[PDB]
Amino acid sequence: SSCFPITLKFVDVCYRTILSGVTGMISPGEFMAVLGPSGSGKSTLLNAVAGRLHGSNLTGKILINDGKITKQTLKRTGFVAQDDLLYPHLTVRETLVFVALLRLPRSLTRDVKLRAAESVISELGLTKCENTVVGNTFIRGISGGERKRVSIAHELLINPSLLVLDEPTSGLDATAALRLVQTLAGLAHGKGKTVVTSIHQPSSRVFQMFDTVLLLSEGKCLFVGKGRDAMAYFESVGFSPAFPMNPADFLLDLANGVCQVRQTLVTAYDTLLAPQVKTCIEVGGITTCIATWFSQLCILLHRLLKERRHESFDLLRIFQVVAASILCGLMWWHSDYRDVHDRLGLLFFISIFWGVLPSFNAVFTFPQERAIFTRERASGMYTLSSYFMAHVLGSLSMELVLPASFLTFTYWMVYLRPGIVPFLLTLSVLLLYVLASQGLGLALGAAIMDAKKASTIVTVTMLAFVLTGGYYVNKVPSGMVWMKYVSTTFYCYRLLVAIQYGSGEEILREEEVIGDVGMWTSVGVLFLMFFGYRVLAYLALRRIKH
Amino acid sequence: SSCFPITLKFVDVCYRTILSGVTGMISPGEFMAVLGPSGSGKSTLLNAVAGRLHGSNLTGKILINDGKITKQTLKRTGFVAQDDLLYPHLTVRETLVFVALLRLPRSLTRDVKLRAAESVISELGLTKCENTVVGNTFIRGISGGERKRVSIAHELLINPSLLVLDEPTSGLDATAALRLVQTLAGLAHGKGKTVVTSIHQPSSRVFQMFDTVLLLSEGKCLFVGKGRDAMAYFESVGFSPAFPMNPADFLLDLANGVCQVRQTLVTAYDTLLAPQVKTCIEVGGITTCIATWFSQLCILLHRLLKERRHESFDLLRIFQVVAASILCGLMWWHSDYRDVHDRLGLLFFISIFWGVLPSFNAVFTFPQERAIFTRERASGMYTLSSYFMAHVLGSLSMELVLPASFLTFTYWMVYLRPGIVPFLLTLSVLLLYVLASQGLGLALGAAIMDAKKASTIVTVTMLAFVLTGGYYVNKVPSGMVWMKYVSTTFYCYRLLVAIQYGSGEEILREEEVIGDVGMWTSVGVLFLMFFGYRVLAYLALRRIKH
């Protein structure tokens, strides 16, 4: 792999000071480690050499193969970050299949996009756990050193020629962190890539696997050399250990003061190594762009299918609906339609329960997956308008199966109106109201992007929708009668009474409670709240500038 | 300190195998490290040598100063565990003052119990942050290496002569984990104590601070010696490194296979070191016991005072009560008492809101602090009956200030009955109902001890209390009329109507809604649910056998 070499030179990097004159070169086929104490800015060097600091404070010359950070050579570079962002309910094989269908170019087949995702599984040693779910801290999945190899496989699908990693071995074991360094040395030696990593606290034989070492001590680097003459260099200045110790622990003490002194390391670097490195340092149309959109939406629906039915079918949401079905069928068992005060309280309990329950569970959707979206939209996998519509279409399928089972169990126990026409009109109003209540939660969760702070604002909003719905207060004090024309509970409840009683005179053989609004101007407003709360959630997610 | 030495011998420990013949002795004034791979059972050795495995599977001779694990010599032993259990809202000084008032003996003054808690602060180096709050991951407190010194200070108040620690330096920094080992070597050398610790992955100069080393490789130990002749012993068998490396990394490779082989280490141990260690291995009344109880309750009230007002006065619970006060004063503004259907809906909204809101927030109390309670009750600081009554008395003070401010703002806006006698009877019924609704949440949170699983059972229970309360369903189908005699919402709502309308005939100048239950048999049942739900929470916490 990678028969197209690369050479990375970063003459005089200065970031504002964090970095103050870092200079070195990275030949193709080298495995380099950036060593430094926690604060020297060894994470800032990796981002500003992979093209993540966009020339604002970065005053240096990051030139890639005697060039620049032009986008033609930036698609040959992968940056593996420090935290892992994976979906739990996908297995290891189908994690890397949906990523290969989104990242690899559109002018290929589906044949060599599945053989490009199984040549990456059986190269990082993931062929044992490929049918095991990924999981998280709450789902029994895969181990944390084998969870890191899925993040590295996510970057090797596009076949990069420069791989930049940010603390791979961190939290891993003693022997899991050695086999990971042994494959990263197998990429740089066997394939011919160029790996630049930053190891925090290496070990006695992890330091033997390295090839070149960079030592940062708050800005100015102290040593750039081939990783086994590091201990023979500092004894020429006059620094040497006493007791037998790790060669990586002797260097990380010279980086912060403790010797066996910090200022003479900086002066001796600019007189013997910096003259040595800097002499060598110069020598489709319209039909294409629509079918690309619908394929981004069909992959993102199947990728998120297992996540949506984890939200809407756990056993603590089924138990709240089975309980409310039994308590309604036992309180209003074989109810009579001639006592109007009881049946109007049945029809208002349905409006409270199915407006509070869809709106509350919808404010957790977008703040839960924000780091996953902003990492993957910035990497060119998908846009916002196809990510968003895969949540709109995928949530109006799973959220319409518990209210449809509530009503079937309950409709002929409590003796509502008999017939197939009053039953299918009562189900249609109930499912339109669940979709209008859900979009109010999606609009408040996206505008605020905090799940605990928006959970109390949907409480206060839905408390005012119930009180102005038309059941508790029979006469409203004349500066509050405007308030019922914005609530979803008012328009649902006037439609349920119009189906069960009609115009009103059929029971007259209690008139302000069977009053007049209109049956076509109540379904017309529940569609304006269906479409209108989904548009205000798109515009609230458009504001997040990456 | 510790002018009463101790000598720990643990001849032939075998635990069922985890441990299979561990044998050694620990002289007074030594700092010993137990080294081993993750799985060798170096945590099981520390618990079974501090007296935490109670002779069931532990088939060995744990003898302490040629004795046994009799309770007279077990109060001279401190075991610092691995995770830290601290209250966040207490500062560092008053954390160690409440612990000193509970652990030190009762036959002292309060003078030398505060000078015994400030000679521990200015000995572990906590005199800089003594006025800084402890915090957690969510509150900005103190650093995680300085959070560990508060756990060690918790065990040095009783002045032990054997201190046993379980991975102290874990998650700490490179230089924070060196200064912690330097004070633990200052206890064993300067004072004269006996420190036995188990370090996971030590460093190059952390290994120089040790004095004796124990090396466990799955059961049978491989080396017991004075920590600087460890590398000179294995080269006499014929094992030696090649590249320069940490002496703790060479040993932890011989413990699992990897050499520069595992079975010849076990045989060579039982022929040269085991004959060497085993030749030396033999040569008040009634007024006292009540005032002790009331002092445990006065300390535990002030210790938990800052935690109770974090629960009941955050800005997301104040915003739900200010919103409901405004929505009630605007919907029923200057209401009239002659339209009875509106005022009965005002009095039923108060019963729903103040039964759902106290019961929901009470199921989080006991599962939140279970590891703190079971650690500290087992250590002899307090019992269950004084820990429990400090939550009962401390929660009926802070939970009666938001419903008392709700009613004062609202009572003369919505024009309920004028006078000081109908106002103080309406406040008294509302505060008795809040205390009865709270105990139902405490009983369900303690029986289940899971905050998410009990949060849906208080939902289903309080949904059935509302529907059988007496407002929605006017006639109940004759097998469900028993169900209203167990709900708290029924007994509160019949008392509010009896204060605002009375016997009923005063408005008769709508009779099943101003019916008959009794005003003394409704306050008598709200007290039986006050006391009865608190007794069922004590019996549900009594079942947890440590």
Author numbering:
A (entry chain A), B (entry chain B): 33 to 48, 82 to 325, 337 to 359, 377 to 602, 626 to 662
Any passages from the paper?
ABCG25 in Arabidopsis thaliana has been identified to be an ABA exporter and play roles in regulating stomatal closure and seed germination. As a ‘half-transporter’ with only one NBD and one transmembrane domain (TMD) in a polypeptide chain, ABCG25 forms a homodimer as a functional unit, similar to other determined ‘half-transporter’ ABCG structures including the human cholesterol transporter ABCG1 (hABCG1) and multidrug transporter ABCG2 (hABCG2)39–47. In this study, we determined the high-resolution structures of ABCG25 in Arabidopsis thaliana in the apo, ABA-bound and ATP-bound states using cryogenic electron microscopy (cryo-EM) single particle analysis.
The removal of CHS led to dramatically decreased protein yield, indicating a critical role of CHS in stabilizing the protein. Nonetheless, with the purified protein, we obtained an EM map with an overall resolution of 3.7 Å. The protein structure remained almost unchanged compared to that determined with DDM plus CHS extraction, with an RMSD of 0.33 Å. However, in this map, we could still observe the two identical densities in the cavity, further supporting the idea that they are not contributed by CHS. We speculated that they may be some endogenous sterols in Sf9 cells.
